Amino acid sequence: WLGGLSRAAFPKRFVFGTVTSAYQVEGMAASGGRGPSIWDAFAHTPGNVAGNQNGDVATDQYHRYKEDVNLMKSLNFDAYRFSISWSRIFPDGEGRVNQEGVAYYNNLINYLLQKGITPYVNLYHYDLPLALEKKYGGWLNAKMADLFTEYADFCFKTFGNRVKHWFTFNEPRIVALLGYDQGTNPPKRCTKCAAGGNSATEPYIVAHNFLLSHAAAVARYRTKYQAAQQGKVGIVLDFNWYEALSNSTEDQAAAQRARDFHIGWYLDPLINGHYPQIMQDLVKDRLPKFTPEQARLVKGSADYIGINQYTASYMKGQQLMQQTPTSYSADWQVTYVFAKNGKPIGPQANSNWLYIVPWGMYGCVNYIKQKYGNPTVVITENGMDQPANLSRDQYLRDTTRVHFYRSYLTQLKKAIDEGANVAGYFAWSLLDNFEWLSGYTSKFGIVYVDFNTLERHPKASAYWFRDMLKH
Ligand SMILES: *[C@H]1O[C@H](CO)[C@@H](O)[C@H](O)[C@H]1F
Numbered sequence: 001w002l003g004g005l006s007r008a009a010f011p012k013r014f015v016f017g018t019v020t021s022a023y024q025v026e027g028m029a030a031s032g033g034r035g036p037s038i039w040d041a042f043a044h045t046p047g048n049v050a051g052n053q054n055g056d057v058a059t060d061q062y063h064r065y066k067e068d069v070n071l072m073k074s075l076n077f078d079a080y081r082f083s084i085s086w087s088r089i090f091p092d093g094e095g096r097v098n099q100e101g102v103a104y105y106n107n108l109i110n111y112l113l114q115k116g117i118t119p120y121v122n123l124y125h126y127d128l129p130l131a132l133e134k135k136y137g138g139w140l141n142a143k144m145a146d147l148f149t150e151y152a153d154f155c156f157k158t159f160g161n162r163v164k165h166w167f168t169f170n171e172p173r174i175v176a177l178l179g180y181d182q183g184t185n186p187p188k189r190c191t192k193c194a195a196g197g198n199s200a201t202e203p204y205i206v207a208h209n210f211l212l213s214h215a216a217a218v219a220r221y222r223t224k225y226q227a228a229q230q231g232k233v234g235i236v237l238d239f240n241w242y243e244a245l246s247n248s249t250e251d252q253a254a255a256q257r258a259r260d261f262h263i264g265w266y267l268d269p270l271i272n273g274h275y276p277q278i279m280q281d282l283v284k285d286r287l288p289k290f291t292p293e294q295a296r297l298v299k300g301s302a303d304y305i306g307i308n309q310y311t312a313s314y315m316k317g318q319q320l321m322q323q324t325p326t327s328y329s330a331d332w333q334v335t336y337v338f339a340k341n342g343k344p345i346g347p348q349a350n351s352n353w354l355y356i357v358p359w360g361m362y363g364c365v366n367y368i369k370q371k372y373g374n375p376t377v378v379i380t381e382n383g384m385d386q387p388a389n390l391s392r393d394q395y396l397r398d399t400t401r402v403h404f405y406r407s408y409l410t411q412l413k414k415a416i417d418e419g420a421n422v423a424g425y426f427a428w429s430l431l432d433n434f435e436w437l438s439g440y441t442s443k444f445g446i447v448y449v450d451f452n453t454l455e456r457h458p459k460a461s462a463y464w465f466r467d468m469l470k471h
């Protein structure tokens with residue numbers, strides 16, 4: 001069951017929470033004044049999502065939020081990570097404020113605080129207002145720094161007297177990779193793609209604009225709001241572990257290149273004020289250059305680093321070669337390997353990419369500790385999924401997820417006990433929800449949602465957390 005885990009097993013004041021995102025749980029997608037996001041358009045196109053499903057209703061947290069807050073309190077959590085939908089506040093992304101949308105987030109924030117749950121609020125979670133994509137070209141346009149800063153400024157002004165823990169973005173790497181390299185997520189851009197694109201250049205432009213936008217929003221917070229509000233702003237980055245397949249110089253170099261192209265892409269700017277040297281060396285003029293002023297704005301602009309952690313891969317490499325650029329992915333010059341000594345690195349959850357590898361959690365956390373001066377880290381996503389078509393009772397008896405959290409949290413504890421500066425941990429997700437391309441066919445919740453009736457039922461993993469987290 002608990003395997004020796006409890007509040008006592010983690011540092012004093014360590015924060016435990018659950019996480020959702022706006023489009024994945026709110027519903028009321030075209031109601032309450034909300035304007036469309038790029039995901040509304042994408043999900044409404046036949047063939048784009050499993051079963052042609054979409055987030056129109058999702059879990060209907062918009063109507064049920066007091067139920068869900070009551071539930072998280074009953075499970076002994078300290079905090080809730082959620083996102084504000086930009087197009088719920090500004091239907092066109094700029095200009096007119098939707099007061100009904102503002103009222104929803106006020107109501108949610110106020111109820112959280114009433115119930116003793118700390119809000120950790122993300123400003124952006126893949127849901128760019130569609131109007132901004134069409135008018136400006138979204139994250140390809142450097143003007144996004146201004147547009148995002150004005151949106152952030154409004155949120156700081158309106159909610160920041162109560163909200164003290166912000167994040168700007170969720171997983172800029174995934175937007176760059178899936179939206180602009182592979183072209184499998186909105187705006188579906190890539191070298192071969194019908195929408196246009198260039199997999200060798202656009203991912204780097206987009207990443208750069210996320211970094212500049214984050215920096216501009218934080219500078220606005222620090223200069224205009226922080227003295228009065230006394231809160232913090234971070235950023236959420238995905239990081240999955242890479243382990244050299246062998247101890248060869250080439251395999252070790254490959255694993256390190258992968259780390260640099262994956263997490264270094266953002267952390268070297270945010271902590272050290274420059275892109276990783278290897279990215280400079282290999283990507284050359286396709287990697288934008290920060291001016292000294294921009295680099296100084298970006299360096300130190302995250303008060304904490306959210307890390308989204310799921311899995312690990314073995315990496316194989318060879319000698320670096322001169323090659324015609326094709327894509328961000330190809331630029332790494334690495335070979336993924338998912339077995340060693342005839343054994344898979346771990347069993348898979350429902351998602352094909354999700355190998356259950358608890359030691360990857362230690363790997364990631366220790367790596368950031370040792371390489372980047374031990375910055376304050378919050379694990380802002382960790383969890384696993386069940387498949388579609390199970391019975392209610394099969395969903396509830398989620399013994400594999402219980403094992404997942406016990407093992408991964410044991411590994412996190414190992415890193416923390418060795419000195420890693422981890423301040424909190426958030427389980428993805430409180431609720432089964434809309435899993436992007438997988439629609440409702442992937443179930444990540446510690447709480448089961450019946451998508452016919454919308455009823456919530458805590459799974460065994462929810463009660464595991466309740467027991468572990470009891471005060
Ligand atoms: C992190 O991962 C989960 C599982 O794939 C997604 O549902 C979240 O939106 C993402 F932030």
Ligand SMILES: [Zn+2]
Nearest residue numbers: 060062063064
């Ligand atoms: Zn409803």
